[PDB]
Amino acid sequence: GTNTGGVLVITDTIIVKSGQTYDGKGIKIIAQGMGDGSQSENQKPIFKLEKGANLKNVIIGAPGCDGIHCYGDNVVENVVWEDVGEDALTVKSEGVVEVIGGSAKEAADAVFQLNAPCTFKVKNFTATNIGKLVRQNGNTTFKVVIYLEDVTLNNVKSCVAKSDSPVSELWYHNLNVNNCKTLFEFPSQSQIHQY
Numbered sequence: 001g002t003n004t005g006g007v008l009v010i011t012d013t014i015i016v017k018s019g020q021t022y023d024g025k026g027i028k029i030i031a032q033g034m035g036d037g038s039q040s041e042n043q044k045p046i047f048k049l050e051k052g053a054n055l056k057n058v059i060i061g062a063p064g065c066d067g068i069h070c071y072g073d074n075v076v077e078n079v080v081w082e083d084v085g086e087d088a089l090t091v092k093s094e095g096v097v098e099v100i101g102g103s104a105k106e107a108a109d110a111v112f113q114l115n116a117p118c119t120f121k122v123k124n125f126t127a128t129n130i131g132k133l134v135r136q137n138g139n140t141t142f143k144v145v146i147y148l149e150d151v152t153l154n155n156v157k158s159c160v161a162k163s164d165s166p167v168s169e170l171w172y173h174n175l176n177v178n179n180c181k182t183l184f185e186f187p188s189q190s191q192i193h194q195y
């Protein structure tokens with residue numbers, strides 16, 4: 001992309017409005033004053049994607065802070081997290097959220113955090129050195145449906161995906177996992193399906 005080689009240093013969350021597409025054209029973003037990328041829960045998101053907002057073609061440098069907050073009906077395309085912060089992307093409100101392309105590395109805990117009922121799809125994605133790829137918020141029992149399609153994972157220190165919800169489901173297709181003791185931590189393994 002034509003912003004490749006540039007570094008945008010920001011000091012507040014970038015809000016992408018409903019109906020908008022933020023296209024970074026390959027820019028690298030470094031956030032300052034928004035978090036250190038540790039496990040502290042009080043960091044700011046790099047991006048807030050309002051319902052029906054899209055994001056594409058961004059590299060998020062360290063510190064990853066609180067990553068991308070999605071409010072539903074969002075396409076997140078070609079986003080690279082060089083160093084995931086507290087988490088990489090959080091679904092904050094109901095809708096369909098797509099992560100297509102890109103990659104993530106160095107997530108101490110979760111990459112994707114699902115805090116509202118949603119349909120969540122990860123497609124054509126790589127992640128390395130992570131605690132979990134997907135976590136439905138603990139002890140919640142609303143329904144999420146997760147799809148992992150063409151996803152390649154390496155060095156997964158807890159599990160691919162974890163939910164405490166019996167009604168939630170995970171579907172996978174062309175999933176490749178290296179160095180994970182425990183793929184799925186759901187109430188029953190019958191909640192996990194191939195397609």
Ligand SMILES: O=C(O)[C@H]1O[C@H](O[C@@H]2[C@H](O)[C@@H](O)[C@@H](O[C@@H]3[C@H](O)[C@@H](O)[C@@H](O)O[C@@H]3C(=O)O)O[C@@H]2C(=O)O)[C@H](O)[C@@H](O)[C@H]1O
Nearest residue numbers: 039041086087090109110113115132135136137138139162
């Ligand atoms: O949106 C968030 O960032 C979310 O973070 C916390 O919750 C997650 C997870 O949903 C919780 O179940 C909990 O996870 C457990 C441990 O606390 C955690 O360090 C790791 O060991 O995983 C555990 C697990 O998956 O069960 O805490 C997670 C976290 O620390 O990020 C908040 O509690 C939640 O309110 C919200 O802010």
Ligand SMILES: [Ca+2]
Nearest residue numbers: 039086109110
């Ligand atoms: Ca955490």
Ligand SMILES: [Ca+2]
Nearest residue numbers: 041086087113
């Ligand atoms: Ca957290």
Ligand SMILES: [Ca+2]
Nearest residue numbers: 083084106107
């Ligand atoms: Ca990290």
Ligand SMILES: [Ca+2]
Nearest residue numbers: 066086087090
């Ligand atoms: Ca978080």
